[PDB]
Ligand binder design. Sequence first.
Ligand code: HEM
Length: 152
Amino acid sequence: GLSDGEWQQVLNVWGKVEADIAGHGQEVLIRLFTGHPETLEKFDKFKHLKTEAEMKASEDLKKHGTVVLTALGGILKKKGHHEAELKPLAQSHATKHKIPIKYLEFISDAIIHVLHSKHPGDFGADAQGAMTKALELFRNDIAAKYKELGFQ
Ligand code: HEM
């Protein structure tokens, strides 16, 4: 449950991401893959990436970062009213991709990390609070769908 003020912060921060969706998407995935190497194993199309240089050079990684952040942005713009947007993602990630909720925790923290990295001094305490709550909400609603499916 986010306040309207918190949602305003979320979408204000998102404006930073939208100015360079590919660049943000790329760094988020790289932070995920290098911080938690087991997550790379879930991607048949990225598991060949052995070095961070290779990750940085991959146009397809950037493409997927765009896909991921575009989807997340679509969800965030719904300000919590995201059942229709979220259900297919929970379903594909539980049943097809088999992504444990732990990895969604990982990518949530990676997003926070990247925002501070790209916008140091410009991602204030209040903005971080609001963004964190938004990502928790996202995670929590996926977790509900996971429980429904008995997916661990
Ligand atoms: C903000 C969090 C995330 C969002 C919004 C997101 C969104 C998406 C979307 C829109 C797709 C393509 C459509 C689909 O297959 O449902 C996708 C595919 C995929 N996602 Fe996620 N994802 C997220 C997190 C993750 C994480 C943390 C992992 C693994 C650690 C992951 C693994 C995958 C894989 C393996 C695919 C298929 C890629 C392919 O082979 O083309 N996702 N994701």
